[PDB]
Structures are given as C-alpha cells and as structure tokens.
Amino acid sequence: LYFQAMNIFEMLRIDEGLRLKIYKDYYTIGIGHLLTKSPSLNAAKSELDKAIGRNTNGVITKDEAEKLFNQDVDAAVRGILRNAKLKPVYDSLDAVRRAALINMVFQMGETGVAGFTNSLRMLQQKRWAEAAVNLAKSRWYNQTPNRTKRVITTFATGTWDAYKNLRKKLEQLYNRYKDPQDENKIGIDGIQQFCDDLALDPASISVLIIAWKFRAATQCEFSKQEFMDGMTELGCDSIEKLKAQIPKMEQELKEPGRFKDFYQFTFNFAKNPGQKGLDLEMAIAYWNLVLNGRFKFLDLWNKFLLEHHKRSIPKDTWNLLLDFSTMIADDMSNYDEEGAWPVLIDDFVEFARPQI
Numbered sequence: 350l351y352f353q354a355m356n357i358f359e360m361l362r363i364d365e366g367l368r369l370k371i372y373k374d375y376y377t378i379g380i381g382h383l384l385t386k387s388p389s390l391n392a393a394k395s396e397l398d399k400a401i402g403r404n405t406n407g408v409i410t411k412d413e414a415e416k417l418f419n420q421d422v423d424a425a426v427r428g429i430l431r432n433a434k435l436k437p438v439y440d441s442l443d444a445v446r447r448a449a450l451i452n453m454v455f456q457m458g459e460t461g462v463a464g465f466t467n468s469l470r471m472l473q474q475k476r477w478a479e480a481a482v483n484l485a486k487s488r489w490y491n492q493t494p495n496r497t498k499r500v501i502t503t504f505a506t507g508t509w510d511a512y513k514n515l516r517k518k519l520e521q522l523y524n525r526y527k528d529p530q531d532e533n534k535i536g537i538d539g540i541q542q543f544c545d546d547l548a549l550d551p552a553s554i555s556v557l558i559i560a561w562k563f564r565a566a567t568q569c570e571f572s573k574q575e576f577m578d579g580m581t582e583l584g585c586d587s588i589e590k591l592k593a594q595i596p597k598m599e600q601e602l603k604e605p606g607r608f609k610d611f612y613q614f615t616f617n618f619a620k621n622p623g624q625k626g627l628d629l630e631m632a633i634a635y636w637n638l639v640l641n642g643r644f645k646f647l648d649l650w651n652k653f654l655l656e657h658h659k660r661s662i663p664k665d666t667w668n669l670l671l672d673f674s675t676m677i678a679d680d681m682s683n684y685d686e687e688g689a690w691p692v693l694i695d696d697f698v699e700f701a702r703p704q705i
C-alpha cells in the first residue's frame with residue numbers, strides 16, 4: 350500500500366477534527382473512524398484493541414489514529430472508483446483535487462457527493478472557476494461554511510493554500526500568547542494577554558464559557574493543541590472572530606441540556622490535576638459563577654459548607670446540586686428527606702429549614 354497520504358491526514362484533522370478517546374456519533378475514534386454498529390462499548394473497545402494490537406482502553410496516540418485514517422482513505426478511494434458517477438471525475442483530477450473530493454466523501458458519503466452532478470461535471474472539465482462558484486450556492490456551504498470554503502479553494506486553485514494560510518494565521522496568533530520558558534504551551538502571562546485581548550477578566554463567566562467551548566482540560570493551563578483545535582473547530586482565526594462568537598455560546602446555555610453539560614464540565618476544569626475531588630473554596634468560587642441567578646439558597650449553601658462541611662466536594666455531589674437547585678421550593682417543603690440525595694444535601698436542608 351506504500352506505493353499508493355501526508356497532506357490528506359492534516360487536511361481532515363483540520364476539517365473534521367481528531368479525537369484520541371472513544372466518542373459517540375455510534376462508537377467512533379480518530380478522524381471519524383467507526384469502530385462498530387453494536388451499542389456495546391465492550392464490543393467497541395474489542396474492535397479498537399484488535400485494530401491497534403494493544404489494550405488501548407479506548408485511548409490512542411495520534412500515530413495510531415493515522416494508521417486508522419489511512420485505512421479509511423483507502424476504503425473511501427475503493428468506494429469512489431466503484432461509483433459510476435464519481436469514478437470519471439476522480440480519475441480526471443490531480444492529487445490535490447482528489448484529496449478535496451475524498452474530503453467531501455468523508456463528510457456526506459458517496460450519495461451526498463453524487464448529488465452535485467453539475468459541479469462534478471465542471472470539475473471533470475477543469476472549469477475550476479465555474480465549479481468553485483457553483484459549489485458555493487449549495488446547502489453544503491451553509492451547514493459547514495469554514496470547511497466548505499477551504500475545500501472549494503482546494504478545487505479552485507489545486508493548492509493547499511486554504512489549509513496552509515489558516516495554519517499560518519493561527520501560528521502567528523499563537524506566538525503572541527506562548528510561554529517564553531515553554532514554546533509548546535500558553536503560560537500565566539499568555540492566558541492573561543488572551544483575556545485582555547478579548548476585553549474580559551480571566552476569572553469571568555465569559556472566559557469559563559470559552560474554556561467549555563475549547564473543551565479545555567484545566568484552569569490556568571492552555572496547551573498549543575487546545576488553542577489550535579479550539580480556534581479551528583469554532584471557525585475562528587483571530588481574537589475578533591472569537592469575540593463575535595460569545596453571544597452564540599451564551600444563547601446555547603439558555604437550553605437546559607447545554608447548561609447541564611457546561612455545569613458538569615466546570616467541575617472537571619476547576620479541579621487540580623491528580624485530585625478526584627474539588628477543594629471547597631474552589632467549588633464555592635465556581636458555584637458563584639455558574640449558579641448565580643439559578644439557585645435561591647446559594648449563599649446559605651456556601652455558609653453551610655464553610656461552617657459544617659469544610660472538606661472537598663465529590664463530582665456526584667457537584668452534579669446533583671444542579672438537580673437540587675431546580676426542584677427545591679422556596680420553603681423547602683417539597684424536599685424528600687427519605688429520598689436519595691447526598692447526605693451533604695440532607696444536612697443542608699436540616700441546617701437551612703429553621704432559618705426559613
């Protein structure tokens with residue numbers, strides 16, 4: 350197979366993203382690699398372990414993700430060649446433009462691409478300008494504007510310029526924030542600068558919302574990969590573009606499913622690496638950010654903890670506090686003491702009830 354890859358992996362890592370842990374679409378890993386149609390994680394991990402050749406426990410390296418991606422490219426190419434509507438266009442195209450076609454197949458499948466009859470004909474005819482304008486009129490252009498414009502530029506030019514130029518813009522922007530003592534990360538000063546550039550306080554709710562959108566691991570830490578992947582997935586190539594995305598992120602949090610996801614993410618982001626629980630003072634500081642205007646008993650809860658708990662907060666307790674805040678009556682008369690809440694919440698209700 351070595352006779353038949355370098356550019357296509359980085360092109361789809363940018364457009365689709367690379368995930369090093371087993372996720373849901375269906376059990377997937379890497380750049381959209383399907384593991385099984387079975388709903389069993391045990392089946393999914395089994396397929397992944399067999400494919401890789403080690404006990405991965407659903408976690409892989411970038412190189413392992415590449416081995417899997419090359420298999421999917423080779424399978425995609427076989428599919429295109431057996432398709433009577435796609436084979437002529439594929440055969441006629443140069444190496445760079447074939448990569449843009451495989452990119453479309455990865456996104457919407459053979460049937461999706463085969464639907465672009467007029468555009469595919471223009472490509473086969475090497476009518477690059479006419480094809481570029483024609484592909485931009487589709488629904489494909491609206492659903493994924495950043496990805497589509499990059500793929501369209503690949504067909505228009507026959508160059509990697511759309512991917513090369515985004516990487517240049519993000520790499521130049523990165524240099525403003527990188528740590529002088531460590532080129533592969535953004536340090537304390539860099540994070541402060543990033544927040545200043547956004548006209549936001551680093552301890553503000555807006556910055557915590559951005560960390561959620563970037564899927565950042567830990568507070569006061571920001572890796573180069575987090576910056577690169579975050580900015581690309583959000584479709585931002587500048588601070589101004591990221592700044593303009595903040596109201597959209599705010600709107601999402603008005604939907605309870607998104608809010609629940611952001612709320613639970615906060616615990617994982619707030620905690621110290623190597624620690625399973627969140628120290629009380631930290632838990633209170635983040636609760637004041639995320640439960641502000643959502644929990645009537647927030648101050649009395651903080652006072653209770655500082656005076657009667659004075660210990661770390663486990664994840665389950667953090668998660669369940671949101672359900673408590675939502676259901677609790679202003680007089681606490683609906684609280685099920687004989688129910689299944691953490692002992693800490695039963696003790697809070699016992700402490701709070703005589704205080705009205």
Ligand SMILES: *C[C@@H](Cn1ccnc1)C(=O)NC[C@@H](NC(=O)[C@H](Cc1nc2ccc(C(C)C)cc2s1)NC(=O)CC)C1CCCCC1
Pocket residue numbers: 540543544551552553554556557559560561563565567568569570571621634635638
């Ligand atoms: C720096 C850290 C020191 N420390 C104390 C105990 N363990 C570690 C610290 O001060 N932690 C608590 C702070 N948190 C913050 O100030 C953070 C700073 C940021 N980290 C990141 C990471 C990634 C990003 C990118 C851009 C996605 C951005 C930022 S800003 N801020 C937040 O966590 C947002 C709220 C505070 C304690 C008081 C309550 C607020 C947080």
